[PDB]
Amino acid sequence: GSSGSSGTGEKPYKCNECGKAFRARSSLAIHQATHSGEKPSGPSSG
Ligand SMILES: [Zn+2]
């Protein structure tokens, strides 16, 4: 694995969906726009 630690690193925003941490809101939002998912046309996967 990895330590994923480079000097400073404050996690002001935390995604209550997976566990991601962004520096600002905009950064968090853009991501939250990936979780959305329903009525999938093609369950072939899973
Ligand atoms: Zn997330």
From Swiss-Prot:
Q: Where are the zinc fingers (C2H2-type)?
A: 13-35
Q: Where is the signal peptide?
A: none
Compartments, record wording: Nucleus
Question: Domain of life, per the record?
Answer: Eukaryota
Which family does the record claim for this protein? Belongs to the krueppel C2H2-type zinc-finger protein family.
The protein's job, in short, is: May be involved in transcriptional regulation.
Query: What is the designated name of this protein?
Result: Zinc finger protein 347
| Gene name of this polypeptide | ZNF347
